[PDB]
Ligand binder design. Sequence first.
Ligand SMILES: Nc1ncnc2c1ncn2[C@@H]1O[C@H](COP(=O)(O)OP(=O)(O)OP(O)(O)=S)[C@@H](O)[C@H]1O
Ligand SMILES: Nc1ncnc2c1ncn2[C@@H]1O[C@H](COP(=O)(O)OP(=O)(O)OP(O)(O)=S)[C@@H](O)[C@H]1O
Lengths: 146, 73, 74, 74, 367, 293
Amino acid sequence: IARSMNRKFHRISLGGVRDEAEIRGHRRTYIGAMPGKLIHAMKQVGVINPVILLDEIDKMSSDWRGDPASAMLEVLDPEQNNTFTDHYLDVPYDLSKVFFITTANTLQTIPRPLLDRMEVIEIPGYTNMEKQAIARQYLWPKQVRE
Amino acid sequence: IARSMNRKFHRISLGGVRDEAEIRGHRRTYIGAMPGKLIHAMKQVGVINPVILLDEIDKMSSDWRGDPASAML
Amino acid sequence: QREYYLREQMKAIQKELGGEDGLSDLEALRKKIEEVGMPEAVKTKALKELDRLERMQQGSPEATVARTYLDWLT
Amino acid sequence: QREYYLREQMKAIQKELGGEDGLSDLEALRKKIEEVGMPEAVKTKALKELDRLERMQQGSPEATVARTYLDWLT
Amino acid sequence: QREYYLREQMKAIQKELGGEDGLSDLEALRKKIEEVGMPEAVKTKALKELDRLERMQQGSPEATVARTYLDWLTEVPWSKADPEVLDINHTRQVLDEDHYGLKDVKERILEYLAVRQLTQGLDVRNKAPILVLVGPPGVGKTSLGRSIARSMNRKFHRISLGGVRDEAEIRGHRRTYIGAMPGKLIHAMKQVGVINPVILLDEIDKMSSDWRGDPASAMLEVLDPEQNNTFTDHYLDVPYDLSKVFFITTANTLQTIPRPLLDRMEVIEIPGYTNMEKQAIARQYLWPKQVRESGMEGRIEVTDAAILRVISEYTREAGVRGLERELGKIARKGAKFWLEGAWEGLRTIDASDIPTYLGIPRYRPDK
Amino acid sequence: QREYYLREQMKAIQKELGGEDGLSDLEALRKKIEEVGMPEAVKTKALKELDRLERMQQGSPEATVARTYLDWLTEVPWSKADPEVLDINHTRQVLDEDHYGLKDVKERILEYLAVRQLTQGLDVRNKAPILVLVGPPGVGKTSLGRSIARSMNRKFHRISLGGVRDEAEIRGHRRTYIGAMPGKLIHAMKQVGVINPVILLDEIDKMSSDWRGDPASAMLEVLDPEQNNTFTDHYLDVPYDLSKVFFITTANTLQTIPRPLLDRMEVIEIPGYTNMEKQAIARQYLWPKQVRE
Ligand SMILES: Nc1ncnc2c1ncn2[C@@H]1O[C@H](COP(=O)(O)OP(=O)(O)OP(O)(O)=S)[C@@H](O)[C@H]1O
Ligand SMILES: Nc1ncnc2c1ncn2[C@@H]1O[C@H](COP(=O)(O)OP(=O)(O)OP(O)(O)=S)[C@@H](O)[C@H]1O
């Protein structure tokens, strides 16, 4: 979808933070300046259009303090994201040219309000004929020429 | 109702809560604590008089950890 | 002699350039306290924690907890 | 003109206190303000990261955290 | 005021000294920071520090940490390695005189040497996976670390984890503090002289977490070969490259290893040893060491039925330490019997003369 | 004569430093470094640490931290022998005084001392045992440690690990902190003067294992039958040698000890006592003491 729409592609997904405060940034009051994870993906691109894939959103990063809901609800809703603010950003940031991709395996651990925006794309599996065709076309030249 | 009264609207979706620490806070003596859902809603509304919808207060996961129904009292 | 003099020449430059503002985050927090609200006991609690942040330094890990406490209060 | 002249004598301290100096500084991210972006509010915060930064040119325990935040912001 | 004057006297003497002895060491580091190895950005950060303030006797807190950072930056190895191995049959000549058995690990080493030799394209010299050894306690893991490092004839250093719960032993602290403390990796790289060593990371099962998180995020930052090419520190301010370093990690189970580390892993299950394998290692490695330390060399000898008695009736483990101590007890009992009156030649221990030396057989034999 | 003038000016420097403190006990530190034999990497590391510490005085606090580093490093013993007195009838009669019965452990000490006569100069490894004593609470185990350490004319030290969930008691905090301090074990080696002591780790089956507060996995670098020639604490940045140490640990139940620690240690079980044993223990150990007191 990135190369068809002439866009970039970045991964960065759930499982790398301790709370949604680490989904956001951290203020300069600390010594260890932990940036917002999002902005760090935006730093490595010189384009504010492309997609951002959310691999394994059901594999959360929760704790007894903080569920991964509020920092996700303020970036997935198409309303409050137009003026976005991190603790390591503290300025009006704009999310209207991006088109996010979310990847999951099970909808059951996803909370109820964040299902307001999700659109269900499911996977049928693969036939052994389909896997034989995949392994001829697409896996054998990579793993052999590597 | 929010439009007819001309006030702010907000939605808290309960049913997923499991302890009293997601309705109240925890304590300041635990690293990184925060207050509960009602304080989140008051943070995200702007006035003293919004309306707050409470979806599925009848399905709150009161369990071996605690009972947030008493926290709701 | 030149060291002590010329760094004062540096601060000369700065005291003309910056001037007069009183612009930081601390008295901004105090102003944000004194604008909205407040009930009386809540106000005195916030002023105690504000002074507890004021006369000392910036960097201790309990000051981060008190900072998050005041930021959740405002 | 007053800008030119105050920065004249500031970088006269630079070539004067010439190790190395100045951090040759804050004449220079002045060009990536309008180049990299920017809206007005980022300009309000980061132009209040020029001269009260210029207050000294040593260390710092402040210049590293403000360095990371500002060079993140630019 | 008197102290300020006499400190003037002292530092006057010093600047004649920094003429007299105080040339040709910082000058010699300015040579050696511009000698072979250093990248261009590292040369720029080396040119950053050239404005000195010259008060190195009466203090100074801003004079000694810059010298410390300069020494740490100039002592880590920059672009130097002992050459590649040419014969992979000789790799089998070396790996087989340390361990009986362990086919799979030797095969993976030979495969990695064959792939590194035969590739002249790309996509595998950059991406070579990290071995994760998993096995029950008692099988050989650390001795494999030494045997692999001597097999390829590379240098070696071993980092033990498990007592580490702080992040600043993998990363370090900021260089503006009092104690200049880079992480364990900068120590492990200045120990070896080459830029391509073998590093054994002991016990990634046991990195406990605490406040300010766990150092498992730093482990993600070091055990993924797509960002450690630009691996920077909190102490160092240059991008170092931990790409070619052949990491080997040991473990006892995979659950307590974090899931951000089970993406750039490659598990190898060591199932345990069997009775013939234990008997072969028992002879050819455990017995002459357990007799050479005990001083009873050429005065006592164990048979091969007797090792089978010791294995089947005096140890139940998936490893070889219980067998090691059970042989050591025989060596000590013989060393005690020698002082009560010597014999001639060497007494030989058949499988029936064990319980004189080892008491009651604990585990019944399977009949 | 000009270097005489020059380092004489430095004599005057330390005359104003503390009357001392610039080449007085700094050079006493050079003596005690080139006293008792350190390994050469550790020795040159201590020499460059002394070289970075030498030419400053009285500030900064980094001078104080490095002074305490060279006070720890040059006082923990390096090559401080304990003379193995090799009589096996004297030591048998000394072990027979403090305890009755206990045939297994006394036979073990006689075996592990009869071996140490027949050391054929070099070519041996000289590795000390690592015992674990397992028994019910009343049976004398902690009493036996000082008895064994006195019979062999060695030294003795205790470490109680009774309820520690505190990691970095075993290892230390790294020296960049404020109140930095080594572990329990390097301090236990510091108080003893020799490198052949008898360390009694008291309650090793009562510790903690949790996602925060797991000290039992930090006992891997210590109770190590091969690789404890490379022990790495966090305060000292050098490998310290713990092979010569006659460790004795006690426990109560094997069911609560971690699996990478049972195989590091050598189990010796103590099977309570019987009525004849208790009666003899009573008559010649318990009743005279309770009559005296
Ligand atoms: N097949 C073998 N050949 C030779 N020596 C062996 C063999 N298997 C084990 N050993 C020896 O047995 C001892 C076990 O070494 P380690 O690998 O440290 O044991 P370990 O199981 O790794 O301990 P942990 O707790 O899992 S780190 C060493 O002395 C090895 O040399
Ligand atoms: N066989 C014995 N002969 C003489 N005194 C003994 C004997 N067995 C035990 N004692 C004495 O009984 C007491 C037992 O003390 P401890 O050694 O502390 O017992 P302990 O079992 O080590 O305690 P715990 O619960 O195991 S830590 C001491 O006063 C010993 O001297």
